[PDB]
Short mmCIF file of C-alpha atoms in Angstrom, two decimals:
data_model
loop_
_atom_site.label_atom_id
_atom_site.label_comp_id
_atom_site.label_asym_id
_atom_site.label_seq_id
_atom_site.Cartn_x
_atom_site.Cartn_y
_atom_site.Cartn_z
CA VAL A 15 -48.90 24.42 -57.68
CA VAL A 16 -52.16 24.53 -59.46
CA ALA A 17 -53.08 26.29 -62.44
CA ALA A 18 -56.77 25.90 -63.92
CA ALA A 19 -58.01 27.42 -67.20
CA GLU A 20 -61.72 27.68 -68.51
CA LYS A 21 -63.03 28.30 -71.96
CA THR A 22 -67.21 28.46 -72.40
CA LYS A 23 -68.25 29.26 -75.62
CA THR A 33 -62.94 39.00 -93.99
CA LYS A 34 -59.60 37.72 -92.88
CA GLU A 35 -59.19 36.78 -89.06
CA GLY A 36 -55.78 35.44 -87.73
CA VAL A 37 -53.84 35.46 -90.66
CA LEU A 38 -49.90 35.42 -91.02
CA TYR A 39 -47.91 35.91 -93.96
CA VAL A 40 -44.33 35.68 -93.38
CA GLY A 41 -41.08 35.39 -95.62
CA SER A 42 -37.76 34.21 -94.28
CA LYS A 43 -34.50 34.64 -95.87
CA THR A 44 -30.90 33.63 -93.91
CA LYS A 45 -27.61 33.02 -94.79
CA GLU A 46 -26.86 31.40 -91.63
CA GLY A 47 -28.95 30.81 -88.47
CA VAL A 48 -27.71 29.40 -85.32
CA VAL A 49 -31.17 29.17 -82.86
CA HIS A 50 -30.47 27.97 -79.25
CA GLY A 51 -34.47 27.37 -78.20
CA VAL A 52 -34.15 27.41 -74.66
CA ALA A 53 -31.05 25.94 -73.02
CA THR A 54 -30.00 25.43 -69.12
CA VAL A 55 -26.24 24.55 -69.21
CA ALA A 56 -24.37 23.78 -66.07
CA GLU A 57 -20.58 23.63 -66.02
CA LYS A 58 -18.80 22.43 -62.16
CA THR A 59 -22.28 23.81 -60.74
CA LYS A 60 -23.51 21.71 -57.59
CA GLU A 61 -27.55 22.84 -57.36
CA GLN A 62 -29.54 24.11 -60.97
CA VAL A 63 -33.18 24.62 -60.75
CA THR A 64 -34.77 25.92 -63.85
CA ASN A 65 -38.47 25.98 -65.15
CA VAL A 66 -39.52 27.16 -68.31
CA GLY A 67 -43.27 27.83 -68.98
CA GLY A 68 -45.43 28.64 -71.27
CA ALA A 69 -44.62 29.48 -74.95
CA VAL A 70 -41.79 30.51 -76.20
CA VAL A 71 -40.90 31.03 -79.83
CA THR A 72 -37.69 31.68 -81.08
CA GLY A 73 -36.13 31.97 -84.34
CA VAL A 74 -34.02 34.12 -86.38
CA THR A 75 -37.87 35.09 -87.51
CA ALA A 76 -39.83 34.17 -84.58
CA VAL A 77 -43.69 35.69 -85.06
CA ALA A 78 -46.29 34.54 -82.58
CA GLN A 79 -49.70 35.65 -82.80
CA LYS A 80 -52.65 34.83 -80.89
CA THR A 81 -50.92 33.13 -78.61
CA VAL A 82 -53.62 32.37 -75.82
CA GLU A 83 -57.35 33.48 -76.89
CA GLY A 84 -58.73 31.05 -74.72
CA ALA A 85 -57.66 30.90 -71.33
CA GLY A 86 -54.05 30.07 -70.40
CA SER A 87 -52.71 29.45 -67.00
CA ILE A 88 -49.14 28.70 -65.90
CA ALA A 89 -48.31 28.00 -62.59
CA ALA A 90 -44.48 27.15 -61.53
CA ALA A 91 -42.95 26.44 -58.14
CA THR A 92 -39.50 26.23 -58.51
CA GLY A 93 -36.52 25.75 -55.93
CA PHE A 94 -34.98 23.79 -52.97
CA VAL A 95 -35.52 23.43 -49.66
CA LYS A 96 -32.83 22.47 -47.29
CA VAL B 15 -48.80 29.20 -56.36
CA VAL B 16 -51.74 29.05 -57.84
CA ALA B 17 -53.18 30.92 -61.48
CA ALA B 18 -56.53 30.90 -62.45
CA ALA B 19 -57.78 31.97 -66.14
CA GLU B 20 -61.31 31.88 -67.18
CA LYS B 21 -62.72 33.00 -70.59
CA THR B 22 -66.04 33.26 -71.45
CA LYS B 23 -67.66 33.86 -74.03
CA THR B 33 -62.56 43.53 -92.96
CA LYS B 34 -59.12 42.39 -91.46
CA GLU B 35 -58.15 41.21 -87.97
CA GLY B 36 -55.62 39.86 -86.63
CA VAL B 37 -53.16 40.19 -89.51
CA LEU B 38 -49.53 40.21 -89.46
CA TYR B 39 -47.33 40.10 -92.55
CA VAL B 40 -43.88 39.80 -92.06
CA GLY B 41 -40.55 39.66 -94.34
CA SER B 42 -37.29 38.93 -92.82
CA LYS B 43 -33.44 39.03 -94.84
CA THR B 44 -30.53 38.10 -92.73
CA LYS B 45 -27.43 37.03 -93.61
CA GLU B 46 -26.10 35.85 -90.51
CA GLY B 47 -28.38 35.01 -87.60
CA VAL B 48 -27.39 33.67 -83.74
CA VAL B 49 -30.50 33.54 -81.35
CA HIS B 50 -30.01 32.15 -78.10
CA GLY B 51 -33.90 32.34 -76.51
CA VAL B 52 -34.32 31.51 -73.11
CA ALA B 53 -30.74 30.37 -71.16
CA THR B 54 -29.50 29.72 -67.81
CA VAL B 55 -26.09 29.31 -67.68
CA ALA B 56 -23.84 28.51 -64.72
CA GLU B 57 -20.61 27.95 -64.72
CA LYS B 58 -18.94 26.90 -60.86
CA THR B 59 -22.15 28.05 -58.84
CA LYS B 60 -23.84 26.70 -55.80
CA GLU B 61 -27.33 27.17 -56.08
CA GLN B 62 -29.11 28.71 -59.23
CA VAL B 63 -32.76 28.89 -59.57
CA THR B 64 -34.31 30.39 -62.28
CA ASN B 65 -37.97 30.51 -63.69
CA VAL B 66 -39.35 32.00 -67.03
CA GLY B 67 -42.96 32.14 -67.21
CA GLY B 68 -45.23 33.65 -70.44
CA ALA B 69 -44.25 34.02 -74.02
CA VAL B 70 -41.02 35.01 -74.77
CA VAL B 71 -40.52 35.46 -78.26
CA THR B 72 -37.07 36.01 -79.22
CA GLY B 73 -35.22 36.59 -83.14
CA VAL B 74 -33.89 38.64 -85.38
CA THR B 75 -37.17 39.19 -86.09
CA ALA B 76 -39.47 39.35 -83.42
CA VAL B 77 -43.13 39.64 -83.75
CA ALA B 78 -46.01 39.06 -81.16
CA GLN B 79 -49.60 39.65 -81.77
CA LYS B 80 -52.54 39.49 -79.44
CA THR B 81 -50.45 37.79 -77.31
CA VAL B 82 -53.37 37.28 -74.69
CA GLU B 83 -56.83 38.10 -76.13
CA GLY B 84 -58.25 35.20 -73.39
CA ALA B 85 -57.43 35.52 -70.10
CA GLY B 86 -53.96 34.64 -69.23
CA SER B 87 -52.56 33.88 -66.11
CA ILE B 88 -48.77 33.42 -64.45
CA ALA B 89 -47.85 32.63 -60.83
CA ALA B 90 -44.67 32.08 -59.92
CA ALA B 91 -42.94 31.08 -56.52
CA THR B 92 -38.95 30.55 -56.94
CA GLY B 93 -36.31 30.55 -54.54
CA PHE B 94 -34.97 28.49 -51.93
CA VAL B 95 -35.83 27.77 -48.31
CA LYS B 96 -32.69 27.23 -45.94
CA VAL C 15 -49.12 20.10 -58.80
CA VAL C 16 -52.09 19.84 -60.58
CA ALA C 17 -53.47 21.09 -64.15
CA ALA C 18 -57.02 21.52 -65.42
CA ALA C 19 -58.25 22.79 -68.23
CA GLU C 20 -61.80 22.68 -69.31
CA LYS C 21 -63.24 23.83 -72.64
CA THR C 22 -66.96 23.90 -73.04
CA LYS C 23 -68.86 24.70 -76.46
CA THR C 33 -63.43 34.43 -95.00
CA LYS C 34 -60.02 32.75 -94.01
CA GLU C 35 -59.69 32.17 -90.44
CA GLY C 36 -56.25 30.55 -88.69
CA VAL C 37 -54.53 30.90 -92.38
CA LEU C 38 -50.69 30.67 -92.45
CA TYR C 39 -48.08 31.25 -95.43
CA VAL C 40 -44.37 31.08 -94.91
CA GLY C 41 -41.69 31.09 -96.70
CA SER C 42 -38.05 30.39 -95.65
CA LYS C 43 -35.21 29.57 -97.46
CA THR C 44 -31.73 29.11 -95.61
CA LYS C 45 -28.28 28.70 -96.50
CA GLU C 46 -27.08 26.84 -93.42
CA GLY C 47 -29.31 26.23 -90.27
CA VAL C 48 -28.38 24.57 -86.46
CA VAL C 49 -31.43 24.98 -84.34
CA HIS C 50 -31.06 23.46 -81.12
CA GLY C 51 -34.61 23.20 -79.62
CA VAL C 52 -34.98 22.39 -76.22
CA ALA C 53 -31.49 21.56 -74.41
CA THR C 54 -29.82 20.43 -70.86
CA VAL C 55 -26.45 20.25 -70.64
CA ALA C 56 -24.54 19.58 -67.51
CA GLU C 57 -20.61 19.33 -67.42
CA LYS C 58 -18.62 17.93 -63.89
CA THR C 59 -22.38 19.01 -62.17
CA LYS C 60 -23.83 17.59 -59.11
CA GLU C 61 -27.20 17.89 -59.21
CA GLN C 62 -29.57 19.84 -62.37
CA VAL C 63 -33.22 19.89 -62.26
CA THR C 64 -34.70 21.24 -65.11
CA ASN C 65 -38.71 21.05 -66.26
CA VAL C 66 -39.68 23.03 -69.65
CA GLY C 67 -43.58 22.96 -70.12
CA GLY C 68 -45.77 24.20 -72.96
CA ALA C 69 -44.89 25.00 -76.06
CA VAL C 70 -41.88 25.67 -77.32
CA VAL C 71 -41.48 26.63 -81.33
CA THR C 72 -37.82 27.04 -82.12
CA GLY C 73 -36.42 27.25 -85.76
CA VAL C 74 -34.50 29.52 -88.26
CA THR C 75 -37.94 30.48 -88.73
CA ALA C 76 -40.41 29.96 -85.86
CA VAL C 77 -44.18 30.41 -86.51
CA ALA C 78 -46.46 29.78 -83.66
CA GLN C 79 -50.12 31.06 -84.43
CA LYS C 80 -53.25 30.64 -82.45
CA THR C 81 -51.19 28.17 -79.52
CA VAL C 82 -53.85 27.85 -77.16
CA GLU C 83 -57.39 28.76 -78.19
CA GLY C 84 -59.10 26.14 -76.15
CA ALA C 85 -58.24 26.26 -72.23
CA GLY C 86 -54.53 25.30 -71.96
CA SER C 87 -53.02 24.69 -67.83
CA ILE C 88 -49.36 24.20 -66.90
CA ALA C 89 -48.34 23.48 -63.54
CA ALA C 90 -44.77 22.67 -62.78
CA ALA C 91 -43.17 21.87 -59.40
CA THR C 92 -39.06 21.87 -59.81
CA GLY C 93 -36.45 21.15 -57.45
CA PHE C 94 -35.07 19.38 -54.61
CA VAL C 95 -36.14 19.19 -50.93
CA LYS C 96 -32.72 17.74 -48.80
CA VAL D 15 -48.76 15.70 -60.25
CA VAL D 16 -52.38 15.54 -61.81
CA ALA D 17 -53.02 16.85 -65.00
CA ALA D 18 -56.87 16.66 -66.22
CA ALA D 19 -58.55 17.57 -69.68
CA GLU D 20 -62.16 18.25 -70.56
CA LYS D 21 -63.46 19.69 -73.94
CA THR D 22 -67.36 19.32 -74.66
CA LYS D 23 -68.93 20.13 -77.67
CA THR D 33 -63.55 29.89 -95.89
CA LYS D 34 -60.86 28.63 -94.95
CA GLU D 35 -60.09 27.61 -91.22
CA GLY D 36 -56.94 26.24 -90.03
CA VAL D 37 -55.04 26.42 -92.43
CA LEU D 38 -50.89 26.70 -93.13
CA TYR D 39 -48.90 26.65 -96.49
CA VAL D 40 -45.14 26.48 -96.08
CA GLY D 41 -42.62 26.29 -98.75
CA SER D 42 -38.81 25.82 -96.92
CA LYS D 43 -35.52 25.59 -99.01
CA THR D 44 -32.47 24.98 -96.85
CA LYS D 45 -29.55 23.89 -98.41
CA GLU D 46 -28.00 22.61 -94.73
CA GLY D 47 -29.60 21.76 -91.81
CA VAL D 48 -28.81 20.67 -88.34
CA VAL D 49 -31.15 20.63 -86.07
CA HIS D 50 -31.23 18.92 -82.44
CA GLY D 51 -35.19 18.50 -81.25
CA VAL D 52 -35.03 18.24 -77.49
CA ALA D 53 -31.75 16.79 -75.64
CA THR D 54 -30.37 15.95 -72.43
CA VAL D 55 -26.38 15.64 -72.44
CA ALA D 56 -24.70 14.93 -69.54
CA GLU D 57 -20.89 14.44 -68.98
CA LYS D 58 -19.65 13.41 -65.70
CA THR D 59 -22.70 14.69 -64.07
CA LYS D 60 -24.06 12.79 -60.78
CA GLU D 61 -27.62 13.82 -60.69
CA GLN D 62 -29.20 15.04 -63.48
CA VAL D 63 -33.11 15.28 -63.46
CA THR D 64 -34.82 16.56 -66.61
CA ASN D 65 -38.73 16.73 -67.77
CA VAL D 66 -39.92 18.42 -71.52
CA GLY D 67 -44.11 18.48 -71.59
CA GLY D 68 -45.91 19.76 -74.16
CA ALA D 69 -45.22 20.38 -77.76
CA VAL D 70 -41.93 21.47 -79.00
CA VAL D 71 -41.70 21.80 -82.32
CA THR D 72 -37.86 22.16 -83.33
CA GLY D 73 -37.02 23.25 -87.00
CA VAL D 74 -34.89 25.19 -89.45
CA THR D 75 -38.30 26.18 -90.38
CA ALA D 76 -40.69 25.69 -87.10
CA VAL D 77 -44.58 26.11 -87.92
CA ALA D 78 -46.94 25.46 -85.15
CA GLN D 79 -50.62 26.48 -85.68
CA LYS D 80 -53.72 25.95 -83.50
CA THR D 81 -51.63 23.97 -80.56
CA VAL D 82 -54.14 23.38 -78.42
CA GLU D 83 -57.93 24.63 -79.48
CA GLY D 84 -58.71 21.52 -76.98
CA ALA D 85 -58.16 21.84 -73.81
CA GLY D 86 -54.63 20.89 -72.54
CA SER D 87 -53.16 20.15 -69.11
CA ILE D 88 -49.53 19.33 -68.54
CA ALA D 89 -48.89 18.87 -64.73
CA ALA D 90 -44.89 17.92 -63.94
CA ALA D 91 -43.20 17.59 -60.40
CA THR D 92 -39.19 17.30 -61.74
CA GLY D 93 -36.73 16.75 -58.88
CA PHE D 94 -35.10 14.90 -56.07
CA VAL D 95 -35.55 14.10 -52.61
CA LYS D 96 -32.39 13.47 -50.28
CA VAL E 15 -49.39 10.59 -61.17
CA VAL E 16 -52.26 10.67 -63.03
CA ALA E 17 -53.53 12.20 -66.43
CA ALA E 18 -57.10 12.32 -67.65
CA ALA E 19 -58.76 13.26 -70.88
CA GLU E 20 -62.44 13.16 -71.54
CA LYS E 21 -64.02 14.41 -74.43
CA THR E 22 -67.83 14.70 -75.31
CA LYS E 23 -69.55 15.74 -79.05
CA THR E 33 -64.42 25.57 -97.18
CA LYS E 34 -61.44 24.34 -96.02
CA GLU E 35 -60.37 23.09 -92.13
CA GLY E 36 -57.09 21.64 -91.05
CA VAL E 37 -55.65 21.43 -94.19
CA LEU E 38 -51.32 21.76 -94.45
CA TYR E 39 -49.16 22.24 -97.50
CA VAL E 40 -45.64 21.74 -97.23
CA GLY E 41 -42.96 21.90 -99.66
CA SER E 42 -39.28 21.48 -98.66
CA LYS E 43 -35.70 20.88 -100.26
CA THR E 44 -32.63 20.53 -98.42
CA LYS E 45 -29.64 19.56 -99.60
CA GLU E 46 -28.16 18.47 -96.50
CA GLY E 47 -30.24 17.80 -93.18
CA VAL E 48 -28.97 16.01 -89.67
CA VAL E 49 -31.97 15.67 -87.00
CA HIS E 50 -31.60 14.68 -83.85
CA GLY E 51 -35.07 13.95 -82.58
CA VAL E 52 -35.29 13.21 -78.37
CA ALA E 53 -32.13 12.66 -77.37
CA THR E 54 -30.64 11.78 -74.10
CA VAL E 55 -26.61 11.26 -73.74
CA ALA E 56 -24.85 10.63 -70.38
CA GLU E 57 -21.49 10.28 -70.85
CA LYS E 58 -19.44 8.98 -67.40
CA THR E 59 -22.57 10.32 -65.17
CA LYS E 60 -23.75 8.23 -62.45
CA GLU E 61 -27.61 9.45 -62.34
CA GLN E 62 -29.65 10.83 -64.82
CA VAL E 63 -33.56 10.63 -64.96
CA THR E 64 -35.02 11.95 -68.44
CA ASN E 65 -39.05 12.32 -69.30
CA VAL E 66 -40.17 13.56 -72.31
CA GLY E 67 -44.13 14.06 -73.08
CA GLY E 68 -46.18 15.09 -75.26
CA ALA E 69 -45.70 16.09 -78.62
CA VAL E 70 -42.27 17.23 -80.30
CA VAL E 71 -42.20 17.18 -83.78
CA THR E 72 -38.30 17.72 -84.71
CA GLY E 73 -37.35 18.53 -88.39
CA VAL E 74 -35.58 20.94 -90.59
CA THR E 75 -38.68 21.59 -92.21
CA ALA E 76 -41.02 20.57 -89.03
CA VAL E 77 -45.18 21.32 -89.00
CA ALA E 78 -47.51 20.92 -86.31
CA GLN E 79 -50.61 21.98 -86.91
CA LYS E 80 -54.00 21.45 -84.77
CA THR E 81 -52.16 19.29 -82.13
CA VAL E 82 -54.70 19.10 -79.39
CA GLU E 83 -58.38 20.24 -80.34
CA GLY E 84 -59.39 17.17 -78.13
CA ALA E 85 -58.30 17.18 -74.88
CA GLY E 86 -54.89 16.48 -74.17
CA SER E 87 -53.40 15.48 -70.62
CA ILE E 88 -49.79 15.12 -69.53
CA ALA E 89 -48.44 14.30 -66.06
CA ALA E 90 -45.03 13.84 -65.42
CA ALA E 91 -42.90 12.94 -62.00
CA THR E 92 -39.59 12.36 -62.72
CA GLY E 93 -36.80 12.35 -60.38
CA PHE E 94 -35.32 10.50 -57.55
CA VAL E 95 -35.75 9.62 -53.47
CA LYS E 96 -32.49 8.81 -51.71
#
């Protein structure tokens, strides 16, 4: 499991957000197990969670994610 | 499982968001197991979750995701 | 499990956010186990959680995530 | 499990946030186990949690996360 | 488990935040075990938690996190 990232090197990249929520419940990244034997979970990269979620320009630079998730029996 | 990303190198990339929610419930990334033996889960890359979700310009730079998810028995 | 990142080297990258929430519950990253034998969980990279979540320019520089999650029996 | 990061080397990178919340509960990163035998959990990288969460320019420099999470039996 | 980081070398990097919360409960990073036999948990990197959380420019310099979390039986 190898990840390699290389980077070699007027409004730009500007965000305005206004949010008005009376009630918010946000769970993000959740793993829940009840009465479970084996649970393997991988979350990788960018997760944005919100009642109001904005992601801008998340990977201008190179980004690498490598995942190997699981079990050997 | 190998990921490689390489990058070699007027309004641009500008977002305006207004959001008004009375009630919000957001779950993001969730794995739930009840009474399960084997659960393997991989989430990779960008997940944006929201009552109002905006993703802009998520990978201008090179992005790589490699996943190998599972089990050998 | 190897990750390598290399970086070699008017409004830019500017965010305005206004948020008004009466009630907020946010869970971020959560792993919950009730009555579970084996739970393996990896969270990698950037997670932004919020009633109002903004991510801007998260990886201009190179970013690498490598994960190997699981069990051998 | 090896991570290597190398870096070699008008408003830029400016954020304004205003937040008004009457009530906030935020959980950040949480692992909860009730009645569980084996729970292995790794959280890596940047997690921002909030009723109002902003992440700007999180990895301009190179960033590497490597994780090996799990058990051998 | 080895991490190596190397760094070799108008408003820039400026944040304004105003927050007004009547009530706040924030949990940061928490591991809770009730009645559990084995719980292994690693949190790495930067976690920002708040009713109002801002992270700006978290890793301009190179940053590496390496984690090996788990048990051998």
